[PDB]
Amino acid sequence: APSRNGMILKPHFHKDWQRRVATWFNQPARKIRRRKARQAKARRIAPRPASGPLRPVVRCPTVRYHTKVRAGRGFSLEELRVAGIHKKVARTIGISVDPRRRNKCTESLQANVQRLKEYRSKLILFPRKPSAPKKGDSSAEELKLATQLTGPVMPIRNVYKREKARVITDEEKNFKAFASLRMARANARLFGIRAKRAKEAAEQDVEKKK
Template sequence: MAPSRNGMILKPHFRKDWQRRMATWFSQQARKIRRVRALQAKARRMASGPSQPIVSPYHTEASVGRGFSLKELRVAGIHKKVARIIGIFVDPRRWNKSTANVQRLKEYLSKLIFFLRNSAEELKLAAQLTGPVMPTQNVYKKEKARVVTEEEKNVKALASLRIARANARIFGIWAKRAKEAAEQNVERKNKALLGT
């Protein structure tokens, strides 16, 4: 019996291996994601990544950071919107200014070559750089093992740190007292000179 209007489909015999007899599109979204990822991987293989700053997560190691700070861009003379266009990562959350990163930006700009859209001959001659742009180099040199000296054994690290911290905290008070003492000495000398 044929189905009539919006009623129930009577006696649907779709249980015997129906997937082979019908075209399904359940993998449509997954295919889309796979295509996008393949395109991104191809773009990564072909082109070099944007320029990134050098940061020091630990005192011995230099690695590539998320993006240049706005201060660094300002010192290098690059607008934040232009930076993103010409392949420079920008991280507005970073607030510090590193002279090494400013120098890195200037070096990147000096090596950058701009092509006009209508210059087809020049574009044919151009070669695309692959791999990381201006890779980082660790400057840390590992020290050789040696015998600990007596002077190093006698150093009390925690005590010296606490003393240094206390000195930094009380420095202003000490300076004020020293200034007052110097002024009192000058007054005493003046009184002594006037008295004699």
């Protein structure tokens, strides 16, 4: 029974919230259950980036979100034959392989290749055995470190480049940026209809001829 100005309210408690309520007095003991994993996993895999394997730079999808960047799932395949890394080797070398990405542009390809090129260079391949041959990095580059990378390997920060102030040529200063949007949005509006008339008018040039 409402009385004099409120909202409507469709609170959804007609069902049976009561039985299926989860309270959260786990929350802090869970925090700790978790702690001990983060903790244990690291001490188990001693020299290995604690965070996890290396994971690619990647762009967020839908239109609003565009300008952001992420750790993606894993680096593409096309990406690797280019960096010269075999896909099944990568998986052993702490390089994250999604094999399910349609690579569309050279911009985000080489951007993401440089991460592998970077990785190779600052990676100490700890050799199969102690008395081991090629590709494993030398006993100097080996003593120096026992270093787990705390935090995400080569963390991906959204970084922009400053544009210095300009002069504004009398040409940037003529472009009516509103007008040209309305143009755009009407040519894209009617591109299709306009094309039907060229198709009819091209029909009349043949139909007038016969």
